[PDB]
């Protein structure tokens, strides 16, 4: 259901209450789907040492089948949507309307690369709580999908050309947000947990960790066919639902294959006080809220009588 409303509303995707709703919902859908053979969560009650809670449970081999989810207005509220084709959360929305439920969102947990998500109508869009704060994540929304085939064999495939065109767009937008005479450099993750340093996701019920270095090693404004990225299926990972660790059973199928559409990117920028004329960007992610946030940036719940 849709109903256009002639009035100016105020949005803020960095304080959107619906993000937390999804976040907790997804964390739940997961817990009942991908069950570990053992999970380790911290627990230092300050009673001296740090006790660790451990759970050993069944480990049925199953794959997480993302089923579209629609979020409708909770009891006593209403959902408003910023029909504007290009709006960045924080700010006013002149073209707004009351909706019954959001569009089908395909929940996907992953890092540095948003897959199977909504695309940007007009041009590529970049969003952040504060671009000036290098410690804040930059959400990039593409206007054109970019296929990425991955296999349990140990690698992911991506068109060298298509991706080279997407970077140009991103950098073109970056220099647009920062500096024109500025240079846009794309480097690899600076470091940290595995799940964050690589493009991590779950395919065929297994956890992948693919080295994205090749995807982020380029400079802008200053044969060749497919790109092959090294992956690796792990059994022991770091939980994303909360600080914790988990171990799953080894693969049973010998032919795990997945195809997704790169739709968005989570970037982070390098600090430095008055260095020079150039900015370096790196793959980000970790906080799945930024993933939900990339889809929910246009909605908002509101109290209604």
């Amino acid at each position: 259901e849709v109903v256009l409303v002639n009035v100016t509303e105020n949005f803020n995707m960095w304080k959107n209450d619906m993000v937390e709703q999804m976040h907790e919902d997804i964390i739940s859908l997961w817990d009942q789907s991908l069950k570990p053979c053992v999970k380790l969560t911290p627990l230092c009650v300050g009673a001296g040492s740090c006790n660790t809670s451990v759970i050993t449970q069944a480990c049925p081999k199953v794959s997480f089948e993302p089923i579209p989810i629609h979020y409708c207005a909770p009891a006593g509220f209403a959902i408003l949507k910023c029909n504007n084709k290009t709006f960045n959360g924080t700010g006013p929305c002149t073209n707004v309307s009351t909706v019954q439920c959001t569009h089908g969102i395909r929940p996907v947990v992953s890092t540095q690369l948003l897959l199977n998500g909504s695309l940007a109508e007009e041009e590529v869009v970049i969003r952040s709580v504060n671009f000036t704060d290098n410690a804040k994540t930059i959400i990039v929304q593409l206007n054109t999908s970019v296929e990425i085939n991955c296999t349990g064999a140990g690698h992911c495939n991506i068109s060298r050309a298509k991706w080279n065109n997407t970077l140009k767009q991103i950098a073109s937008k970056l220099r647009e947000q920062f500096g024109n005479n500025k240079t846009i450099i794309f480097k690899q993750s600076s470091g940290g947990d595995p799940e964050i340093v690589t493009h991590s996701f779950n395919c065929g019920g297994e956890f992948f960790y693919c080295n994205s270095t090749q995807l982020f090693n380029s400079t802008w404004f200053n044969g060749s066919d497919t790109i092959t990225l090294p992956c690796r299926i792990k059994q022991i990972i770091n939980m994303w639902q909360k600080v914790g660790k988990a171990m799953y059973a080894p693969p049973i199928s010998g032919q795990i294959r997945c195809s997704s559409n790169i739709t968005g990117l989570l970037l982070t920028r390098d600090g430095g006080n008055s260095n020079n004329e150039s900015e370096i960007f790196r793959p980000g992610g970790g906080d799945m809220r930024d993933n939900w946030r990339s889809e929910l940036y246009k909605y908002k719940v509101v109290k209604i009588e």
Partner: antibody
Amino acid sequence: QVQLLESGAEVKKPGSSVKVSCKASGDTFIRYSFTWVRQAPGQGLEWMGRIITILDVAHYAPHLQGRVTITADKSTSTVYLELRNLRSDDTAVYFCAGVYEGEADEGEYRNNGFLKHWGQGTLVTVTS
Amino acid sequence: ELELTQSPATLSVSPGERATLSCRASESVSSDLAWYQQKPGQAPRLLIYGASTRATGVPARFSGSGSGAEFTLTISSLQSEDFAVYYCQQYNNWPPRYTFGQGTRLEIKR
């Protein structure tokens, strides 16, 4: 391949506690999982329990779960077996054994159950 | 409650001949079955795991097959050094509650 050196024989009275050790050397201690297996004179092998050295988590046999504890000190590459409330029927040789699981330190864990590396074994006599 | 059982309590075979050891389970174990050899006063020796893969340093005369709740340990030409006790072991369940068979004694027949 790792080598499994067990601690010397034990002679304890019923009701006492025992703590046998096993020093592994030869490879990456955290890339292996260890298991303890006892054997009473004239009898077969009895699985006691196994620890996933990397996670530091152990699982024990039912009839033993509760008065048995297995641990490992990644610092000294040693595994320990602890048996409380000793019983005469506990008299037996205690074997320490391990197996490669993959690059556990890198998140690869096959969770292998079989046992490839064994130790000389430790005799533990429980009597009055 | 998974219990393994080795049929031949004692197998008397002539030197040079072949020997076959059976190990059934009270429940399906798939292929998580392993075989062990044990000389007196020594630690057990791993011969086969995954029901059929031979462990390093294990001669080809040694071989294992089967799945489910029935397995076999075949030794082609029994050599003097193959004189020992053999145990099977299933490690399929989880939580880990692995168990051993009561063993089979392969003795020299004369």
